[PDB]
């Protein structure tokens, strides 16, 4: 907030490969889905429902506060078409991405977008082409104070892409990953094109997940769960275990509900607070010199935190970079797994015997 930048969509337009994935429209419906991912987060949100049309336009819906109206007293326009029609940055100190830009990347990238806003018991519409203004925002219909949300339908412009054509299976694995990592959470999706219909609520979360992607046997055989860890205003959820069958491996991380596959100070944070909690325990119950390497090397994990301002890092900006995070995670993790070991000492003499041996080569 230092540097705060403000710019048309033109970068957008004439590299579109540095703001999304150019193979389809997946990566922009993506973008639209975190935006409602973070009212769902910020705790006002719990629906969110995709659409896919015969025309090859994708809708995405909530039940959000709705996107502001109200007029920029400097930049003259409603809240809604500054956020579509300007790509907005800012930072510390002068310095695209896949992650962090913003739902504007969308507008650029489109034919056509249209947006209806439930707000203050107004419903609000506008229409932007190729990343402008075509029709002014607009109350067109009235509705309870209560029913709130914004609706975002979109004609991805073939200019950009190799196909305009939706990959089904990539959007319903992104899917069903959003909505098992958030138990507030209940996703729809409705294929026009193929005529069907998903809906995703997962009640427990994580629980049973990697049972069900190993299997194969791994230490703890109950794969061990963070469940909400939270300090306040950051949250941290995780599952993880060891496994010694390497045919299957399964290390995801997630910030805000998005992959980060490029890690980040969330991995570096559980990496350390398990090695913090193995070390400890050797320690307080007992030989080599184990490293923080050793005892990552066969976990399988996924992580997932909410914290409110992420910041990427790295030219695609899949890396989570936010400093504090790393801390966060390790203690929590040391403190979480220190307790299980101390309660379950056959299993974790297996956990600790097993890491090392990875550590004596
Ligand atoms: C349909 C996708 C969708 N749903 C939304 N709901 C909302 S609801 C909402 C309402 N009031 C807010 N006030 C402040 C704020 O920081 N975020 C807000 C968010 N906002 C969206 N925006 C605004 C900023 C940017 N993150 C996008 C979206 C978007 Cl985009």
Known sequence: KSIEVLTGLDPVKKRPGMYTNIENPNHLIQEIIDNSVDEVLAGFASKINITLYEDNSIEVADDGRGMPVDIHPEHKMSGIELIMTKLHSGGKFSNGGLHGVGVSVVNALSTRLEAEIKRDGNVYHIVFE??????????????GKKNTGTKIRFWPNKKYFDD????????????????????????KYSNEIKKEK????????????????????????????????????????????????????????????????????????????????????????????????????????????????????????????????????????????????????????????????????
């Open 130 to 143: 190729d990343g402008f203004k075509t029709k002014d925002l607009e109350i067109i219909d009235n509705v």
């Open 164 to 187: 305009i054509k939706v990959n089904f299976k990539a959007l319903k694995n992104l899917l069903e990953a959003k909505a098992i990592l958030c138990k507030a959470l209940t996703i």
């Open 198 to 361: 998903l809906t995703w609520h997962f009640e427990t979360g994580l629980k049973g997940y990697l049972d069900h992607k190993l299997e194969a046997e791994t230490l703890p055989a109950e794969p061990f769960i963070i469940d909400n860890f939270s300090n306040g205003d950051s949250y941290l959820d995780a599952v993880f275990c060891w496994c010694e069958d390497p045919s299957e491996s399964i290390k995801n991380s997630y910030v805000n509900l998005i992959p980060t596959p490029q890690d980040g100070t969330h991995v570096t944070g559980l990496k350390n607070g398990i090695y913090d909690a193995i070390k400890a325990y050797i320690e307080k119950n007992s030989n080599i010199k184990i490293t923080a390497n050793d005892s990552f090397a066969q976990l399988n994990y996924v992580i997932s935190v909410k914290i409110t301002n992420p910041q990427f890092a790295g030219q695609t900006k899949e890396k989570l970079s936010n400093k504090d995070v790393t801390n966060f995670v390790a203690t929590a993790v040391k403190d979480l797994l220190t307790i299980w070991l101390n309660q379950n000492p056959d299993e974790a003499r297996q956990i600790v015997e097993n890491i090392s041996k990875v550590a004596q080569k």
